[PDB]
Amino acid sequence: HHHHHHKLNLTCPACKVLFTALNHGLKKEPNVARVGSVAIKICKMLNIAPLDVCQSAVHLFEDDVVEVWTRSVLSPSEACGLLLGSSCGHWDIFSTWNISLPSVPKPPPKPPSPPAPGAPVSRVLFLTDLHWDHEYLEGTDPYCADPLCCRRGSGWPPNSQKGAGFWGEYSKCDLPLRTLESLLKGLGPAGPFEMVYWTGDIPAHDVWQQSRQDQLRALTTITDLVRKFLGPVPVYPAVGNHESTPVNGFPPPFIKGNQSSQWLYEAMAKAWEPWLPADALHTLRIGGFYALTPRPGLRLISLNMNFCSRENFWLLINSTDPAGQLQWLVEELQAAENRGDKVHIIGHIPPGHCLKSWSWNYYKIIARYENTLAGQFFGHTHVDEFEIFYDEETLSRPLAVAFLAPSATTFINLNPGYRVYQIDGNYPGSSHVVLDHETYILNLTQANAAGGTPSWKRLYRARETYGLPDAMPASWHNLVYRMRDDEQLFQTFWFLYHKGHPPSEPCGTPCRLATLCAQLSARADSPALCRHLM
Numbered sequence: 001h002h003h004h005h006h007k008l009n010l011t012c013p014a015c016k017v018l019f020t021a022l023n024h025g026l027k028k029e030p031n032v033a034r035v036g037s038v039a040i041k042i043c044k045m046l047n048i049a050p051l052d053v054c055q056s057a058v059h060l061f062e063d064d065v066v067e068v069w070t071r072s073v074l075s076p077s078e079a080c081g082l083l084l085g086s087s088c089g090h091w092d093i094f095s096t097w098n099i100s101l102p103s104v105p106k107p108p109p110k111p112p113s114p115p116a117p118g119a120p121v122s123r124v125l126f127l128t129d130l131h132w133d134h135e136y137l138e139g140t141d142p143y144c145a146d147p148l149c150c151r152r153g154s155g156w157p158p159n160s161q162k163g164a165g166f167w168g169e170y171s172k173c174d175l176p177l178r179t180l181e182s183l184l185k186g187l188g189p190a191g192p193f194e195m196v197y198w199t200g201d202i203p204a205h206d207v208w209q210q211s212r213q214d215q216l217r218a219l220t221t222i223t224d225l226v227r228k229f230l231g232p233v234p235v236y237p238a239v240g241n242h243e244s245t246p247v248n249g250f251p252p253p254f255i256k257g258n259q260s261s262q263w264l265y266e267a268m269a270k271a272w273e274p275w276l277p278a279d280a281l282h283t284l285r286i287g288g289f290y291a292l293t294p295r296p297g298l299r300l301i302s303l304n305m306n307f308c309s310r311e312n313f314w315l316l317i318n319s320t321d322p323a324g325q326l327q328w329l330v331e332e333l334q335a336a337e338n339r340g341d342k343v344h345i346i347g348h349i350p351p352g353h354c355l356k357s358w359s360w361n362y363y364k365i366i367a368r369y370e371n372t373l374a375g376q377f378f379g380h381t382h383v384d385e386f387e388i389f390y391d392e393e394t395l396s397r398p399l400a401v402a403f404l405a406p407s408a409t410t411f412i413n414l415n416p417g418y419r420v421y422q423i424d425g426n427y428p429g430s431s432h433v434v435l436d437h438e439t440y441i442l443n444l445t446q447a448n449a450a451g452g453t454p455s456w457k458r459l460y461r462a463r464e465t466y467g468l469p470d471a472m473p474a475s476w477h478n479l480v481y482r483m484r485d486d487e488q489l490f491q492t493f494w495f496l497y498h499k500g501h502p503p504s505e506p507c508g509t510p511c512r513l514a515t516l517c518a519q520l521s522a523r524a525d526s527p528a529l530c531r532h533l534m
């Protein structure tokens with residue numbers, strides 16, 4: 001219904017035909033091998049790390065990345081839409097998207113009330129980033145050329161240098177199974193616990209040679225070891241980013257067949273059946289997230305933060321609220337608000353590391369349900385730190401805080417560690433909020449020492465060391481700016497940051513202001529949050 005006397009519509013289908021031809025030529029197996037076998041020769045041409053890795057890294061990524069480009073950019077409706085305009089398609093890739101909040105008016109912000117005298121306190125264990133390395137070996141080179149050392153294939157160290165420790169090593173290494181058994185055995189004094197939050201990243205960083213059997217092997221092995229030492233204590237876990245292979249590869253639910261992540265989510269639903277109820281397992285299989293009620297007046301929500309990860313290449317195809325998760329979260333929160341319940345959110349990748357649009361909608365959801373939210377717990381960063389949320393309009397009022405627990409693994413150059421949270425206990429009228437938290441470590445210098453002992457000691461208690469009236473958002477907000485001025489205090493945070501094993505290089509003024517900026521930045525791509533630091 002368009003009027004012309006010079007236009008040739010020969011260019012619109014010529015585009016569609018031509019890209020449609022590419023895809024058919026890329027799927028051909030004899031062509032895929034051509035794109036792999038050349039890659040080995042290219043890693044020498046681009047001055048890349050050991051080529052032996054390249055012969056493996058590019059192999060696993062190829063089939064999945066290609067499919068994503070054919071389904072995203074080289075999709076006829078997508079590419080031709082970029083060149084010729086709305087006439088021959090639409091360019092949807094990484095388009096901005098929003099979420100709709102319910103029509104329910106937002107209640108006035110009510111600060112939680114301090115716990116009454118004689119109010120019980122519950123202890124919550126927090127395991128994150130275990131990263132079991134089946135191929136960990138003692139005495140092997142910790143400074144190999146591969147991305148991951150201390151394992152079979154990294155060879156032995158030269159000049160009679162000191163090999164890898166028996167319990168781990170300060171380097172780009174992961175943990176042997178024994179060191180995780182030691183962690184779970186020494187939970188006597190740190191307990192008792194009412195429940196455990198377990199935010200994934202079970203398999204090691206040997207991403208280049210991870211079959212699906214090795215990923216399910218790590219799943220059931222550790223899930224069996226954890227259930228063994230926690231007994232009747234329920235463990236509520238979340239999906240990490242090393243759980244699938246290839247790493248970070250989590251195709252949303254709309255993708256079907258062998259290439260979907262059904263192989264993973266359905267194996268989880270079997271390993272985690274003793275912990276999760278029926279309705280929770282349903283959504284677990286589909287998209288790897290779920291919600292449940294661990295105790296009266298509290299709602300637990302486990303998000304699959306892979307559907308926000310830059311590293312998840314499958315999100316090109318459609319990066320709008322993958323799996324409908326944010327829409328589902330809003331429904332869960334809003335329902336809780338009506339019930340008068342509070343909510344705990346657990347995930348792997350902190351919201352500050354997500355895609356800009358995803359993170360901005362999460363940030364606005366938190367603010368809307370500030371009164372309903374009682375805790376946010378995440379991991380991934382392998383480090384002890386936090387992220388403060390502010391009001392969407394002015395970015396001046398702290399209204400929620402997310403705790404990024406440090407990792408059980410040594411990757412990279414850290415002490416093993418775990419984290420126990422003290423929360424307002426199980427009783428009607430409880431705020432369910434975090435009251436304080438404790439961090440335990442395994443000083444490797446001691447354990448690996450001759451005749452050493454594997455003793456898990458408490459590194460510190462949160463309020464005690466930082467002198468905090470409470471674990472509310474306003475107290476961490478104050479702490480950050482306190483460290484902006486007090487150098488000794490920051491060096492304490494810096495020391496605990498790395499679980500008590502700081503780097504050799506001192507952290508100067510530009511390194512400090514950057515690290516504090518991270519604590520205020522729960523919204524990705526938002527420099528205004530650090531206007532007061534620099």
Ligand SMILES: *[C@@H]1O[C@H](CO[C@@H]2O[C@@H](C)[C@@H](O)[C@@H](O)[C@@H]2O)[C@@H](O[C@@H]2O[C@H](CO)[C@@H](O[C@@H]3O[C@H](CO[C@H]4O[C@H](CO)[C@@H](O)[C@H](O)[C@@H]4O)[C@@H](O)[C@H](O[C@H]4O[C@H](CO)[C@@H](O)[C@H](O)[C@@H]4O)[C@@H]3O)[C@H](O)[C@H]2NC(C)=O)[C@H](O)[C@H]1NC(C)=O
Nearest residue numbers: 092097098099100253254318319320321322323324327331
């Ligand atoms: C890219 O993905 C976007 C994300 O949506 C997901 O992506 C696709 C691939 C599917 O996997 C889909 O299941 C995912 O949710 C996508 O934008 C989103 O599109 C969906 C629909 O495709 C919108 O979801 C909701 O649709 C329902 C329809 O009724 C449901 O009920 C029936 C009967 O029980 C069931 O059989 C189904 O579950 C049906 O889905 C709407 O009812 C719902 O309304 C919401 O909003 C109103 C506001 O008036 C609220 O009051 C309600 O409580 C609901 O919360 C949704 O419309 C979804 O809204 C939409 N996203 C946004 C942000 O709007 C996009 O289309 C994809 N793009 C491309 C090019 O493929």
Ligand SMILES: *[C@@H]1O[C@H](CO[C@@H]2O[C@@H](C)[C@@H](O)[C@@H](O)[C@@H]2O)[C@@H](O[C@@H]2O[C@H](CO)[C@@H](O[C@@H]3O[C@H](CO)[C@@H](O)[C@H](O)[C@@H]3O)[C@H](O)[C@H]2NC(C)=O)[C@H](O)[C@H]1NC(C)=O
Nearest residue numbers: 001002007008009010011012013014016017076077087088
């Ligand atoms: C320029 O040409 C393209 C290509 O379409 C084809 O090319 C012409 C030379 C003629 O031979 C056409 O008969 C022929 O379709 C046009 O794109 C095409 O648009 C139509 C509708 O806009 C698409 O058809 C739809 O198909 C669905 C599913 O069957 C139906 O439900 C719809 O009712 C509708 O029929 C067609 O798929 C699409 N072609 C491709 C390859 O995607 C384009 O519209 C044309 N330019 C103008 C200005 O008309």
Ligand SMILES: *[C@@H]1O[C@H](CO[C@@H]2O[C@@H](C)[C@@H](O)[C@@H](O)[C@@H]2O)[C@@H](O[C@@H]2O[C@H](CO)[C@@H](O)[C@H](O)[C@H]2NC(C)=O)[C@H](O)[C@H]1NC(C)=O
Nearest residue numbers: 094095096097098099100101320356357360361364392393
């Ligand atoms: C996504 O949201 C942005 C901004 O948030 C919305 O708009 C604010 C102005 C305010 O009304 C908030 O409560 C909303 O949640 C949208 O910004 C719109 O931008 C258009 C043009 O881009 C502009 O003309 C309007 O001022 C804004 N609002 C409306 C209703 O159009 C943005 O359009 C939304 N969509 C996307 C894809 O980003």
Ligand SMILES: *[C@@H]1O[C@H](CO[C@@H]2O[C@@H](C)[C@@H](O)[C@@H](O)[C@@H]2O)[C@@H](O[C@@H]2O[C@H](CO)[C@@H](O)[C@H](O)[C@H]2NC(C)=O)[C@H](O)[C@H]1NC(C)=O
Nearest residue numbers: 059060061062063064210211212213214245246257258259
């Ligand atoms: C389902 O897929 C797996 C994986 O193989 C394919 O190629 C991988 C490199 C991956 O990137 C995806 O493109 C594909 O799914 C198949 O298992 C592989 O093949 C055998 C299994 O017996 C084994 O030697 C390989 O190591 C497996 N690879 C991995 C990464 O686990 C499996 O056979 C496929 N299922 C069906 C029915 O074909």
Ligand SMILES: *[C@@H]1O[C@H](CO)[C@@H](O[C@@H]2O[C@H](CO)[C@@H](O)[C@H](O)[C@H]2NC(C)=O)[C@H](O)[C@H]1NC(C)=O
Nearest residue numbers: 441442443444445446447449457459499500501
């Ligand atoms: C971890 O253990 C090592 C070894 O026992 C401790 O290192 C000692 O620390 C102080 C100096 O800071 C002195 O006792 C010695 O000079 C250090 N010895 C060595 C070999 O480094 C270390 O302090 C412990 N750290 C923690 C957090 O437990």
Ligand SMILES: [Zn+2]
Nearest residue numbers: 002003004005
């Ligand atoms: Zn005319």
Ligand SMILES: [Zn+2]
Nearest residue numbers: 129131201380
């Ligand atoms: Zn990790």
Ligand SMILES: [Zn+2]
Nearest residue numbers: 201240241380
């Ligand atoms: Zn991670």
